[model samples]
Target: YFQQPSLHYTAAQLLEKGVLVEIEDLPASHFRNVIFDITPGDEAGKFEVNAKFLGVDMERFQLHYQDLLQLQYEGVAVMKLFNKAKVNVNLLIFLLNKKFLR
Candidate 1:
């Protein structure tokens, strides 16, 4: 897994109160086509194996997996909004993911 700078907020905090107000306003006509598939059973099986190996809760794995899916959906929404508003999504993606050379 790739690591980035830590958010000041924890995952739970973000999930509970992240302001996704703008997402609701996204036009159905402007939907950005993206595909997401979840193999929940496979994921659960893997989680069980890994949790048994590492002595962790399967619930934590499930929560983390769901959090990832949530972020991905939200990201797609945000990118679509940016495009609709005539902002460059590529620049945003680059800024978010690019390694700083400094």
Candidate 2:
């Protein structure tokens, strides 16, 4: 059974806070192999960013990407370097159960 990278918190709600929340924000390691693509979201001035975690736990997991920025603050300048074209295969059955499970 394939699984999607779900969010425990609402993207809009988290955006309103506009600050880092401990336990809610993902760790730096989770972003280690991530490649991000940031663009405007459907709503005005909103962002529809997405981060594809390369080879996470031997399976490719495409995170919400918006949360990668909406929840956590900064690092766009550095994270931009990771953006590149690539493909993946052999999807894992399922996971992401325990909060932020790698």
Candidate 3:
């Protein structure tokens, strides 16, 4: 069977940890009704993201951590985030795949 690795993260935690870079160009409050679905991308260390707002479907995009401190996005939500201080890279990857990525 094909692998279906994924993660799930709350908007609040992602925002706090600066892991969720941006989402659908929506405001922070929108996080309450906003959600992200993530899956491993075709490329190694990359991810595909699907955004859902309220009850309506939004856009899908791609993201990858860069420069050891930033998350890069290539579509609608642009799931980018910054690490205020040094942290484990695996932790970030785990966050995306376990909580936010799912």
TM-score of 1: 0.18
The C-alpha stretches of model 3 lying farther than 4 A from their native spots are 1-3, 21-29, 66-102
Candidate 1 lDDT at 29 equals 37
* Structural similarity to truth (TM-score) of each candidate: 0.18, 0.25, 0.50
Model 2, 1-102: lDDT tens digits are 765333332222222332212222445344334443443344433333354544432222334434344433543321211233212111110112232323
Report the error of model 2 at residue 94, Å: 36
Q: Give me the runs in candidate 1 sitting further than 4 Å from their true place.
A: 1-23, 41-102
- Candidate number that wins on TM-score, 1 or 2: 2
How well is each residue in 1-102 modelled by candidate 1, as lDDT tens digits? 765221132222222333122224444332222111112234432211111112222322222334334556567433232222222233323322342211
Full-model lDDT for every candidate: 0.27, 0.31, 0.54
Clash numbers, per candidate: 0, 0, 13
- Residue 33 displacement in candidate 1 (angstroms): 1.7
TM-score: the better of candidates 1 and 3: 3
Best by lDDT: 3
The TM-score measured for candidate 3 stands at 0.50
For residue 54, give model 2's deviation from the true position in Å. 2.5
Number of clashing pairs, model 2? 0
